[PDB]
Amino acid sequence: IIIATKNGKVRGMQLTVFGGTVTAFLGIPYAQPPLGRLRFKKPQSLTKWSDIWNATKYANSCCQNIDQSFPGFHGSEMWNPNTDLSEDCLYLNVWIPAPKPKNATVLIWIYGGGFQTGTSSLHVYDGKFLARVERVIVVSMNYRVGALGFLALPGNPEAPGNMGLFDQQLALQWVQKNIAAFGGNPKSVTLFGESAGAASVSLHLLSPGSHSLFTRAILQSGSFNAPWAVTSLYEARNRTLNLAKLTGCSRENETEIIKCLRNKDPQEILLNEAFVVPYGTPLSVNFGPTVDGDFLTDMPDILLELGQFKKTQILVGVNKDEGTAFLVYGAPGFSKDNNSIITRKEFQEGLKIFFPGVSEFGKESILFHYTDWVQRPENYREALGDVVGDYNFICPALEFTKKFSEWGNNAFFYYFEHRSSKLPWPEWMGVMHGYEIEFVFGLPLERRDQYTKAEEILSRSIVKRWANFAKYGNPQETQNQSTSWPVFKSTEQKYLTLNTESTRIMTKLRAQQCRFWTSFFPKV
Amino acid sequence: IIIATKNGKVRGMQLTVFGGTVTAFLGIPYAQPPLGRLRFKKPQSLTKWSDIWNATKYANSCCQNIDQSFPGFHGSEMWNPNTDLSEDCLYLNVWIPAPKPKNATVLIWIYGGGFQTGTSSLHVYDGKFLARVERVIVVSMNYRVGALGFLALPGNPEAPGNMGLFDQQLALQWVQKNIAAFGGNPKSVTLFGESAGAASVSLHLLSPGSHSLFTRAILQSGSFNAPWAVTSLYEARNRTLNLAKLTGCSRENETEIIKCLRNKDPQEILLNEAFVVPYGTPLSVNFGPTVDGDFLTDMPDILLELGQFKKTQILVGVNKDEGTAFLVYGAPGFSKDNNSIITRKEFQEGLKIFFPGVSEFGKESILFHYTDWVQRPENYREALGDVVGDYNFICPALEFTKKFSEWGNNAFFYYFEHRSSKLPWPEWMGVMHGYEIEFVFGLPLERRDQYTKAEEILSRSIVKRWANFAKYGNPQETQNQSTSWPVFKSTEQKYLTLNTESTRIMTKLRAQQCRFWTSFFPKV
Ligand SMILES: *[C@@H]1O[C@H](CO[C@H]2O[C@@H](C)[C@@H](O)[C@@H](O)[C@@H]2O)[C@@H](O[C@@H]2O[C@H](CO)[C@@H](O)[C@H](O)[C@H]2NC(C)=O)[C@H](O)[C@H]1NC(C)=O
Ligand SMILES: *[C@@H]1O[C@H](CO[C@H]2O[C@@H](C)[C@@H](O)[C@@H](O)[C@@H]2O)[C@@H](O[C@@H]2O[C@H](CO)[C@@H](O)[C@H](O)[C@H]2NC(C)=O)[C@H](O)[C@H]1NC(C)=O
Ligand SMILES: *[C@@H]1O[C@H](CO[C@H]2O[C@@H](C)[C@@H](O)[C@@H](O)[C@@H]2O)[C@@H](O[C@@H]2O[C@H](CO)[C@@H](O)[C@H](O)[C@H]2NC(C)=O)[C@H](O)[C@H]1NC(C)=O
Ligand SMILES: *[C@@H]1O[C@H](CO[C@H]2O[C@@H](C)[C@@H](O)[C@@H](O)[C@@H]2O)[C@@H](O[C@@H]2O[C@H](CO)[C@@H](O)[C@H](O)[C@H]2NC(C)=O)[C@H](O)[C@H]1NC(C)=O
Ligand SMILES: *[C@@H]1O[C@H](CO[C@H]2O[C@@H](C)[C@@H](O)[C@@H](O)[C@@H]2O)[C@@H](O)[C@H](O)[C@H]1NC(C)=O
Ligand SMILES: *[C@@H]1O[C@H](CO[C@H]2O[C@@H](C)[C@@H](O)[C@@H](O)[C@@H]2O)[C@@H](O)[C@H](O)[C@H]1NC(C)=O
Ligand SMILES: *[C@@H]1O[C@H](CO)[C@@H](O)[C@H](O)[C@H]1NC(C)=O
Ligand SMILES: *[C@@H]1O[C@H](CO)[C@@H](O)[C@H](O)[C@H]1NC(C)=O
Ligand SMILES: *[C@@H]1O[C@H](CO)[C@@H](O)[C@H](O)[C@H]1NC(C)=O
Ligand SMILES: *[C@@H]1O[C@H](CO)[C@@H](O)[C@H](O)[C@H]1NC(C)=O
Ligand SMILES: *[C@@H]1O[C@H](CO)[C@@H](O)[C@H](O)[C@H]1NC(C)=O
Ligand SMILES: *[C@@H]1O[C@H](CO)[C@@H](O)[C@H](O)[C@H]1NC(C)=O
Ligand SMILES: [Cl-]
Ligand SMILES: [Cl-]
Ligand SMILES: [Cl-]
Ligand SMILES: [Cl-]
Structure with a gap:
């Protein structure tokens, strides 16, 4: 089964689910790999391939620290990434009912993980049951997390903040442009997410750039007004500079802090995220959404109170x-x-x-x-x-x-x-x-x-x-x-x-x- | 000018006020002097006199401690009693317009003073201006204050509590029985009071025994839900027993504490009121209204919340x-x-x-x-x-x-x-x-x-x-x-x-x- 998309052909795989069939396209790219000079930048649009992209396995999960508190214990380990970590992680998954539906409603999953961790390939996020049983299409994406997804020096395009929210948004755009080819209705798109994934859904309700990319929203255990969900511009600055300090990247010029951070091994950025704050908690979100003047035009509490959000x-x-x-x-x-x-x-x-x-x-x-x-x-x-x-x-x-x-x-x-x-x-x-x-x-x-x-x-x-x-x-x-x-x-x-x-x-x-x-x- | 009342004749005096005349009857008795065995008891009804009671001056004020904080200073001294103190203090005043009105509305004043002090003869409570200018009748009464008005051992008729509230109530009854003889309308009676006098007015709204004794109520700077206005049965017991201790009246039998307290000089009861509590404040009300099962049938907050009060x-x-x-x-x-x-x-x-x-x-x-x-x-x-x-x-x-x-x-x-x-x-x-x-x-x-x-x-x-x-x-x-x-x-x-x-x-x-x-x- 091969579907033609705006950027090229993708091959899926057939799955047996409850005496029926689902077609899964696991690991479709939806942006340029944000590597090298693209590290900390908004995701860049992907250019065409020829031949067939094989979407037959889950792609790399974004770089992130892992929960090592309880090694060997399923309760914690079930949330750890189950695919290799890599900065090359901007991929999404599509599950569709078989036979191909005609104009199916689309469910787009956004994972939680405190904006620091998570991946779409977890077993508990497997969209094949929903596709089978309800004949909806399920889409899920990986988006950047931690400093690589959310490092901010507000206004500076080298590190503007909210990059992982822009990753989510670009995957929403991909569904708009491409889902009809898989039998999906771009005018019937529901976002759903849990914890930081639910906070994210609630920010897409606030973001003018996401307004035409979806219809309805489901928020499981999270919303942007949660105390952990939005990093102040004051916290963000201090954390960015603390991270620069800890990596030898402290500089006079801010565009030179970023250039320096772009030379660091991903693994060195990860090691220092934990310490960018003097005191942390089990609910710390060291690098999260900020008011960046782009995804988020004002403090979201003001936007909510004054009714400036998508009406749905x-x-x-x-x-x-x-x-x-x-x-x-x-x-x-x-x-x-x-x-x-x-x-x-x-x-x-x-x-x-x-x-x-x-x-x-x-x-x-x-x-x-x-x-x-x-x-x-x-x-x-x-x-x-x-x-x-x-x-x-x-x-x-x-x-x-x-x-x-x-x-x-x-x-x-x-x-x-x-x-x-x-x-x-x-x-x-x-x-x-x-x-x-x-x-x-x-x-x-x-x-x-x-x-x-x-x-x-x-x-x-x-x-x-x-x-x-x-x-x-x-x-x-x-x-x-x-x-x-x-x-x-x-x-x-x-x-x-x-x-x-x-x-x-x-x-x-x-x-x-x-x-x-x-x-x-x-x-x- | 001589008016015949249920209990006998009273002579008043003429006053010139604003080119007009008011008749004042100052110091009419409305109960038996609560002396001797009557000390701490509900006021007892007064029996007839012959000849003419001369109500031509203010009567004794009830026993009370005085504010000595600022001797010589009018700001404080204007509130001190301006008539001799005496346990023989159950008197009231009536001011009526001249000529005698036909069915005048009645204003009954209840003074404040924390339930510990006060008297109706203060210059700022002079009812002659109201009588002159608005052609209403003004009545004011002295009621017992301090331990002599409010000492409680709940249920015991020797000291049931709320005695000074019962004094007020009996003066309300006097107006019901007698005011038509002065040209007053007993069916048009408004209570007004300030601070503890306003708290008192608010308790008459709650008391079934006062319901038919007045029409409407004015509360100036007070109400019974104020934190100072009602003494708990727990505080009252402890304060009564503390007072017994301090006067050598501690006894096995509670009816014998009271008998003993009735032998004390009024002045010795007064001296010890201040200390019946370990800590006091400038707003202390050592002896005040209690829930006695008679004037007050239940905690007044419950009565208020559940709408059990006079509807006016x-x-x-x-x-x-x-x-x-x-x-x-x-x-x-x-x-x-x-x-x-x-x-x-x-x-x-x-x-x-x-x-x-x-x-x-x-x-x-x-x-x-x-x-x-x-x-x-x-x-x-x-x-x-x-x-x-x-x-x-x-x-x-x-x-x-x-x-x-x-x-x-x-x-x-x-x-x-x-x-x-x-x-x-x-x-x-x-x-x-x-x-x-x-x-x-x-x-x-x-x-x-x-x-x-x-x-x-x-x-x-x-x-x-x-x-x-x-x-x-x-x-x-x-x-x-x-x-x-x-x-x-x-x-x-x-x-x-x-x-x-x-x-x-x-x-x-x-x-x-x-x-x-x-x-x-x-x-x-
Ligand atoms: C529940 O366990 C805690 C956690 O710490 C312990 O984990 C146990 C399962 C055990 O292996 C133990 O060796 C390990 O340290 C217990 O709290 C600990 O208890 C004691 C006394 O309070 C202290 O020595 C530790 O500081 C303390 N740990 C922490 C993190 O506070 C706890 O007492 C136990 N509660 C029970 C049995 O009800
Ligand atoms: C903004 O960050 C400063 C920087 O302090 C940090 O240095 C980082 C590189 C990192 O290692 C981090 O763990 C370390 O704390 C914070 O100032 C620190 O505050 C703590 C507690 O108040 C003090 O013990 C330190 O004296 C102080 N460090 C320095 C070098 O100034 C500061 O707390 C933070 N501000 C906010 C908004 O949290
Ligand atoms: C206002 O006066 C108070 C009250 O006490 C004083 O009264 C004054 C008018 C004067 O006669 C003085 O001798 C008398 O003691 C002042 O508070 C007092 O000031 C000092 C220092 O704070 C202390 O010695 C006293 O403990 C303190 N008294 C009390 C009761 O707290 C107060 O300072 C003064 N304030 C001004 C002038 O602004
Ligand atoms: C109920 O009253 C007791 C009695 O204590 C008092 O004795 C009185 C005769 C009187 O002189 C009074 O000033 C004195 O305090 C109170 O117990 C007292 O509490 C204070 C402060 O907690 C202590 O310093 C004393 O140890 C203690 N005294 C005695 C002899 O027990 C008590 O506070 C009070 N309870 C309530 C409801 O306020
Ligand atoms: C698919 O249906 C389209 C409209 O259906 C949707 O209308 C939206 C406004 C929203 O309420 C959704 O939940 C509805 O299901 C229609 O415009 C398209 O042309 C259809 N495309 C097909 C059949 O190819
Ligand atoms: C005096 O008027 C009496 C009624 O007037 C009052 O009605 C009450 C219900 C109340 O609203 C008051 O404020 C009214 O003023 C009447 O029943 C008496 O008979 C009158 N007595 C006289 C003229 O001697
Ligand atoms: C994609 O999968 C097909 C079918 O299994 C295979 O023949 C083709 O070589 C694949 N392309 C790759 C591995 O790049
Ligand atoms: C309703 O119950 C029937 C059995 O009576 C079951 O087969 C079906 O799946 C149920 N539907 C839903 C949506 O819960
Ligand atoms: C900061 O340094 C960068 C080096 O690339 C340069 O482009 C920029 O002009 C500098 N900014 C300022 C205003 O100093
Ligand atoms: C009451 O006053 C009148 C008139 O001034 C007086 O004649 C009478 O003796 C008085 N009664 C007394 C003082 O008991
Ligand atoms: C109303 O004002 C007039 C003067 O115009 C004054 O004589 C009168 O007393 C006033 N009435 C009241 C009740 O305030
Ligand atoms: C308390 O003493 C008094 C003495 O007058 C007596 O009347 C009463 O019966 C006594 N009460 C009890 C129950 O001990
Ligand atoms: Cl049900
Ligand atoms: Cl503190
Ligand atoms: Cl006005
Ligand atoms: Cl405490």
Whole structure:
């Protein structure tokens, strides 16, 4: 199977999925390799090839540091890259139903990883189930991460910032130009992403250059108003110069810092990213999106508040225990290998880990708000996870959703509360960050994979709802006497819970907690 | 002029006021003197006299401690009692227009003084101007204050608590039974009071026993939800027993503590009131209203929240600088005799004076909320006064008004912002607590008294508005092209400013401050 694209022919491969066939085109190039003088620059458009590009395997993942905290452990290792790392990493994947569809809706996946890590070739991002079961086309891209994707000296085209967001955008352009050849509808394109991938989706909603590149958006556990999502111009400058210092690249001329950094081995840039900040946290984003005057024209909070964004439907949600994953990456008393019963003093020390530049009063205020107990040994352990999840994911997603919906558009909010039967992490971590993704991609639809029957049913329902959102703007499951998913409006704030037992309509998720983070805490 | 009352004849006296005449009956008894075995008991009804009771001078003021902080100084001394102190103090005053009116509306004044001090014979409470100018009848009563008015051991008729509130109530009953003989309408009775007198008015709104004793209510700088206004049953017990200790009255039997206290000289009870608490403040109310199961059937906050109160119109207001008066009664760096520029550390020490049993985090939170400066030497001095005024008077009056109006009734709120040209206190204290009162009573209507012309005009307008509220439920001045006073509703929260220059309709008084006190601070 060979498809002709604007830049040349690509050969795919046939896959058997559930007694049917999917065609996969893995590793199509969508930009010039950003090597040499192109390092730190916006991606440059790719010129024609002749002969057939073989898109029959996943391409290189972008250069990135790896999580070495738990070698041999599937819970962490499943997120590490599974393809060689290389600066030559600007590739995308396409999965299409067979037979070729006529005008299929397109789902474009944007991975998370804190803007520092990630790749589209992870097993939990495999678009073949969606293509098979819902007859949508799935596209995913690799984009640059870390300093190589996000180093900024604002205004300077040698290192303007947001390069990895421009990579995403150019892959969106590729779909616009090329997807009809694969049987796709460029006028029916939904972005979906998790964590930094969801924050990215929310920035494409804000970016005038992305407005005509997609139709609708799905935000899983992330949005640009999250505290980790956008680097200030002040932080970015200091981090860029710190990185120059650490590599011997400190210079009088800023265009000469960049020239120097372009001579460094990728591996030397990677080694020094960790230290560009005095204190870090398990949620640090050393190199992330900045207000660059190009992708992002103003501080995104101002854009959101004043309604300057693409007017379309959004689907947004979070997991019940967003904060737990992070606690084993440095909070005292915590271990994935015991029940992590901590004391008051450990709790207090954990706040120092998660809120390093925060006044003592700021920290006491967190403790005040989260330790009014309803005695119980896991009180403090539970409070720290909620602190981290509410601050970093849940309250920001809910505020994004309120503010976005106030401008007239339909929004749907979910609260995912199912723990995978196969989860390798301990029970105390509950419904973790990242662990809805396999349900969205339909992994539990595979009977060989040993998920429960209740999990097959949940995943089939989520898959259908996501697909209906993409095709029709409305994440209903219309056939199986399912709970209707109400629109989220800033007054009632109705959301849908996703679980194997009973799906419920609820209101005002974490009302009391989010008043704290959203209205008090930003003042300290 | 001799009027026959249910309990006997009373002779009044004629007064010349503004080229006209008022009849004053000063010092009519309304209960049995609460002496001897009646000390600490509810007031007992008075039996008939023959011959003519001469109500031609003010009666004794109730026993109370005096403000000795500033001897010789009119600013403080004008609030001290101006009649002999005596346990024999249950008397009231009546001022009536001449000629005798036919069915005049009645204004009943309830003085403030923290429930510890006060008397109806103060010059600034002289009802003759109102009677003259508006042809209303004015009534005022003395009620017991301090431990003699409010000592409680709940349930025990020897000392049930709220005795001074029962004194007020019995004087309300006297007006019901007797005012028609003076030309008054018992079906048109408005209560008005300032500070503890306004808190009292707000408790009569809650008390089933007072419901048929009045029509409408005016609350000047006070309401029962103020932090100083209601003593917990826990505080009351401890204070009663502390007082017993300090007087040698500690006993096994509680009815024997009271018997013992009844043998003490009034003057010995007074000397020990100050110490019944370990820490006090300039706003301490050692002996005040309690939930006694009789006057007050439940915690008044519950009654207010759940709409269990007299359904009628209210007029409520506060002064611009409620908090300043108190700062010279113990805050470091403050003096009525210099400009009281204080430092951060003095500010912090002042919080300790005003918030003695409050956690360090509680205090830091106050400081956080009030020291975000918009440098300026008077920053800290101004912040402390606002802290004290917002917490103790303004935010509580506004919350009372919101909650009360949510039940359907018209409410009118004012913000009094005129500083008396004659004020003896320094300019930095601004528009002080207590200093609207002379405008309400029409003192500036007296040309001999050397107030400005702008002050005569302001007082004449307030007088008319207060009188119209009493007679008609609507505090308008209809004749002189005046600003219309809108109803206060919990959504718009419109209020009227009272000043000599420009009277304005404004909204959401101290919105940001009161969110702090009303919604955060009660948690610490
Ligand atoms: C901006 O960066 C400076 C630089 O300090 C850093 O030097 C880098 C090359 C890197 O190795 C990094 O780890 C190191 O901290 C920061 O100043 C430092 O601040 C810390 C803590 O306040 C102090 O211990 C150091 O004295 C100080 N270092 C120097 C050399 O000045 C600074 O914190 C940072 N500013 C922001 C916005 O975070
Ligand atoms: C849960 O484990 C933590 C984490 O650290 C430990 O991991 C264990 C599984 C074990 O292999 C141990 O050797 C390893 O150090 C425990 O916290 C540790 O416990 C003690 C006393 O508090 C200290 O020696 C360590 O500093 C501390 N580590 C950290 C990172 O804080 C924790 O006590 C344990 N909790 C249980 C069993 O409930
Ligand atoms: C209830 O009252 C007690 C009694 O203490 C008081 O004794 C009284 C007769 C009187 O002189 C008063 O000034 C004195 O404080 C309070 O206990 C006291 O608390 C303070 C400060 O915490 C301590 O310094 C004392 O040790 C302690 N005194 C005694 C003898 O126990 C107590 O504070 C109070 N409770 C409440 C609700 O405020
Ligand atoms: C305003 O006066 C205060 C109050 O105390 C003083 O009253 C003055 C009018 C004067 O007679 C003085 O003798 C009397 O003690 C001043 O605070 C005082 O100032 C000094 C230094 O801060 C200390 O000696 C006192 O402890 C302190 N008193 C109190 C109660 O805190 C204050 O400095 C003054 N401020 C000015 C002039 O701006
Ligand atoms: C494919 O359908 C096109 C329009 O369908 C889409 O309309 C969009 C506005 C959006 O709402 C999508 O979700 C809809 O599905 C049509 O214009 C094209 O011509 C079609 N192309 C084909 C059949 O080749
Ligand atoms: C005096 O007027 C009485 C009624 O007037 C009042 O009606 C109340 C319900 C209240 O709204 C007041 O503010 C009104 O002024 C009437 O019943 C009496 O009979 C009158 N008594 C006389 C003239 O002696
Ligand atoms: C692409 O794959 C085809 C079919 O397997 C092969 O014949 C061709 O040589 C390939 N091109 C390469 C490896 O460049
Ligand atoms: C910085 O150096 C570069 C060297 O390539 C040069 O192009 C540029 O003009 C210099 N900038 C300034 C303004 O000094
Ligand atoms: C609805 O349930 C049927 C079985 O009754 C199942 O076969 C089908 O896949 C379900 N559809 C969805 C979208 O959940
Ligand atoms: C009351 O006053 C009248 C008139 O001045 C007087 O004659 C009478 O004796 C008085 N009664 C007293 C003092 O008890
Ligand atoms: C307390 O003592 C008084 C003495 O007058 C007595 O009437 C009462 O019965 C005693 N109470 C109890 C229950 O001990
Ligand atoms: C209205 O103004 C007139 C003068 O024009 C004055 O005599 C009168 O007292 C005023 N009335 C009120 C109630 O303020
Ligand atoms: Cl600090
Ligand atoms: Cl369902
Ligand atoms: Cl403390
Ligand atoms: Cl006016």
